[PDB]
Amino acid sequence: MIVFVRFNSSHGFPVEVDSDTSIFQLKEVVAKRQGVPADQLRVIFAGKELRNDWTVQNCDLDQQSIVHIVQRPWRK
Numbered sequence: 001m002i003v004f005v006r007f008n009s010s011h012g013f014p015v016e017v018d019s020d021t022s023i024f025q026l027k028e029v030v031a032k033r034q035g036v037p038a039d040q041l042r043v044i045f046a047g048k049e050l051r052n053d054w055t056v057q058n059c060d061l062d063q064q065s066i067v068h069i070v071q072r073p074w075r076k
Contacts, residue, residue, distance in 0.1 A: 003061040007034060008070035019057035023050045026061075027069075036071045044068040 001019065006012045007030065015033075017026055023043070031038035043049055045067055050059050061067050 001057065001062050003056065004066040005030065005061075006066055006068050008068075010034070012066055017056050017061075019055055021056045022052070023054055023056060023059060024052035026056050027052075030069055037073050037076075040071055040073045042070050042072055044070070 002014045002016050003026075004012055005015050015026075015029065017029070021029070027041055027043055028038050030036070030043075031041050045059065045061060046064060050061075
């Protein structure tokens with residue numbers, strides 16, 4: 001499924017993910033895509049960060065508004 005996500009340094013882009021794609025895995029996916037430090041990557045859904053170990057499907061990242069992702073790197 002395609003989830004809507006807004007990166008701090010990007011726009012609202014669509015990311016295709018699998019139903020079994022874990023939230024942390026998705027974090028790592030976005031980190032991979034734009035080459036950002038996942039350890040310093042902050043994902044926001046409904047205001048809070050989602051559990052790192054669970055399916056992205058059952059977390060409603062495609063249903064409940066748009067996902068916000070911001071990076072907080074110390075050196076970049």
